[PDB]
Design a protein around this nucleic acid. Structure first.
Length: 126
RNA sequence: GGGGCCAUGAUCGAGAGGGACGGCCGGGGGCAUUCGUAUUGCGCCGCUAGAGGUGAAAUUCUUGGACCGGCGCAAGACGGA
């Protein structure tokens, strides 16, 4: 089995699935939900991430990638740490599309102590 | 102005305090260092067209390579759990 590393930037307003080699140096294939939907409002929807990892499996099989290490990633830093809605739809679409998954681990950029986050002391009053 | 004489003259030790002293204790304070990232900026490597953001949209960034992945580099805040 040709092991790989799959970087899933599961955040809000967009969902990224980035498949690279074992070192993460060369990008084998990467797509976004906006590449499959007409309106950018449906980017964070799990249906867009469902179509994203689907065609990725073909590009992984065409080049020879069979297994993919899951590297789940949220926005991190000052912003939220919980991954977006595409964290599970893209992960399930990867295994269901005839691939292999192994050694799942999430890498979210959590800071020891960040700077002042966007929005004042009163917070985003939406 | 020399002795004698007196039970010869100082109550303490505050469920007040000061200070000493012993083992400490604590995000008390000043200053100098160590470290952790992250945000942001830049270079290189790799692939691709949208990406940022929003309830939705747009400004904005984008085949002058944006966003994203790695190796890095630099500066300034902050000191999470």
């Amino acid at each position: 089995n040709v092991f790989g590393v799959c970087h899933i930037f599961a955040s809000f307003n967009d969902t990224f699935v980035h498949v690279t080699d074992l070192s993460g140096k060369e990008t084998i294939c990467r797509v976004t939900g906006g590449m499959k939907v007409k309106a950018d409002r449906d980017e964070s929807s799990p249906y867009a991430a469902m179509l994203a990892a689907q065609d990725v499996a073909q590009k992984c099989k065409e080049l020879g990638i069979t297994a993919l290490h899951i590297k789940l990633r949220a926005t991190g830093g000052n912003r939220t740490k919980t991954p977006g809605p595409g964290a599970q739809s893209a992960l399930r679409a990867l295994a269901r599309s005839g691939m292999k998954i192994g050694r799942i681990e999430d890498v979210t950029p959590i800071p020891s102590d960040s700077t002042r986050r966007k929005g004042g002391r009163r917070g985003r009053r939406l």
